[PDB]
Amino acid sequence: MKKIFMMVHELDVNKGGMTSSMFNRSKEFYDADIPADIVTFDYKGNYDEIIKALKKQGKMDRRTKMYNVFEYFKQISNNKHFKSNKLLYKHISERLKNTIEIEESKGISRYFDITTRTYIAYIRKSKSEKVIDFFKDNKRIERFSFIDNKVHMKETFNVDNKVCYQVFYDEKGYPYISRNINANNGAVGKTYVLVNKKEFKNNLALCVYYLEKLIKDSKDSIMICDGPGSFPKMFNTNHKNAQKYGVIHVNHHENFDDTGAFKKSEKYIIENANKINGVIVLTEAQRLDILNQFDVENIFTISNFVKIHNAPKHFQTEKIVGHISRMVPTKRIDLLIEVAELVVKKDNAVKFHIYGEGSVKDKIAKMIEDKNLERNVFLKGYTTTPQKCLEDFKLVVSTSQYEGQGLSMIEAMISKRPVVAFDIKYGPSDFIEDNKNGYLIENHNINDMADKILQLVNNDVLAAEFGSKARENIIEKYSTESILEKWLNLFNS
Numbered sequence: 001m002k003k004i005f006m007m008v009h010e011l012d013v014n015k016g017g018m019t020s021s022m023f024n025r026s027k028e029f030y031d032a033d034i035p036a037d038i039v040t041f042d043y044k045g046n047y048d049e050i051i052k053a054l055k056k057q058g059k060m061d062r063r064t065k066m067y068n069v070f071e072y073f074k075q076i077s078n079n080k081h082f083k084s085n086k087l088l089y090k091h092i093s094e095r096l097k098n099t100i101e102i103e104e105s106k107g108i109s110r111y112f113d114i115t116t117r118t119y120i121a122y123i124r125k126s127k128s129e130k131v132i133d134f135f136k137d138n139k140r141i142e143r144f145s146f147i148d149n150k151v152h153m154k155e156t157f158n159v160d161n162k163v164c165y166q167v168f169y170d171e172k173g174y175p176y177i178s179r180n181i182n183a184n185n186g187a188v189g190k191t192y193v194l195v196n197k198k199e200f201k202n203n204l205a206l207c208v209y210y211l212e213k214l215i216k217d218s219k220d221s222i223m224i225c226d227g228p229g230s231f232p233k234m235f236n237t238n239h240k241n242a243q244k245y246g247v248i249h250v251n252h253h254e255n256f257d258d259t260g261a262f263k264k265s266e267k268y269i270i271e272n273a274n275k276i277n278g279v280i281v282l283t284e285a286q287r288l289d290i291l292n293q294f295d296v297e298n299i300f301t302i303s304n305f306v307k308i309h310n311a312p313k314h315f316q317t318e319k320i321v322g323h324i325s326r327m328v329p330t331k332r333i334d335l336l337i338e339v340a341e342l343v344v345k346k347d348n349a350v351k352f353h354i355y356g357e358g359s360v361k362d363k364i365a366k367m368i369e370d371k372n373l374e375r376n377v378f379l380k381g382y383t384t385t386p387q388k389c390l391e392d393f394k395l396v397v398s399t400s401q402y403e404g405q406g407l408s409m410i411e412a413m414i415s416k417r418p419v420v421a422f423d424i425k426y427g428p429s430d431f432i433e434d435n436k437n438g439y440l441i442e443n444h445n446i447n448d449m450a451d452k453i454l455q456l457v458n459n460d461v462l463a464a465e466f467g468s469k470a471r472e473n474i475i476e477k478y479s480t481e482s483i484l485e486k487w488l489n490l491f492n493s
């Protein structure tokens, strides 16, 4: 009788970390016979294709559903009609009646009225996608978006050529939702659900009503909000029996901040912990800190579910140090380069393998060139199989400054690869036992980190013992059975 609704703004094939957490939590909750589906709030004309792709990938469990605010009212309109809205298509054909086609490409074409010479429409076709832009006195006023020759969206433009209004059409061509867009920022204003006849102030108000409609108000209906920006959608509902939980996936203090400010969305989630069933944080250190920083007590520590794959058959004897992450500023790959330079200066043999892609990639590539670390530091690009890459490492490293837990570090430990990491807020101290299953470095101490890398990289006996103890610890501390027990304990409170 228990059912779970997991909130996040959107799902997409590129996304990772928070979605991957939600995807596995769903798999685990479904395995424990508690359906755990995902609720999204954005609009995408191709959501069916995206969900099919995430499932084929093996990323999203087949059992996992995605409820979407738009998709829900879309299927209500689909059942509401049997015949297509031929009147909209005819209205479009009549606009391009006395035209003459002038191409630019295969799909790309411009249409002009042969009796006036006025620019009327721009049409761009791309296999499944088609966009029709309509003009008045040489300026774009409208846009009809198509998938498989069926209209799904109409956008209204202003004098400055920004979208000021949107309409969403069902599979038969019927407008089910319409809304105002504030030109300057792109904020969702006044909304109209045509399928139900109802009207809302903004997207917040719509999604609040939608959650009140999707989720039955009973003790067995559980709302878990992962997306920090979409916490007000869960928070503001009228539900009086249904459970309300917030998951914080990051460190709550602002990144690269010396003022000591908190992340705004997280600050709000936190402040309102007593007013809901609870707020989940990944590590005990985060919870303790939150309790001393805020006048709130309803904070719970539940590590994210951990996937314990079998360990590599063989340990790596070769002096290979691994780093698998998104190439982003918080990861501090600049500090890993500064450490690599210190490591390679004392030992020529050691090699650094850095997997991933992102914003810092070019700044780090040029950094290897300056420090003449070409023969020892390798940017290997993105990996679809980090588990396989891990087999090839003697140890794993983390220069990251900010984390909620640090899943790559946990992943490395599962694959019997010890971690040498900066002792940051939050995560490394939760799972690394210094001088037993890896090393905890004083944050920014590039020299002490370099030392422990050299010690572990040149000791085949220490590397295998730290690796084997790293795996045993993840199994002991983050067992699926213990994590599910913590969640259940809250659901049954």
Ligand SMILES: O=c1ccn([C@@H]2O[C@H](COP(=O)(O)OP(=O)(O)O)[C@@H](O)[C@H]2O)c(=O)[nH]1
Pocket (backbone or CB within 6 Å): 016, 017, 018, 324, 325, 326, 355, 356, 357, 381, 382, 383, 384, 385, 386, 405, 406, 407, 408, 409, 411
């Ligand atoms: O080239 C890459 C880069 C990253 N990852 C994965 O990205 C995740 C990173 O987890 P972590 O918590 O350390 O950092 P986040 O990406 O959430 O900031 C892990 O699952 C990695 O295996 C991957 O598959 N290939």
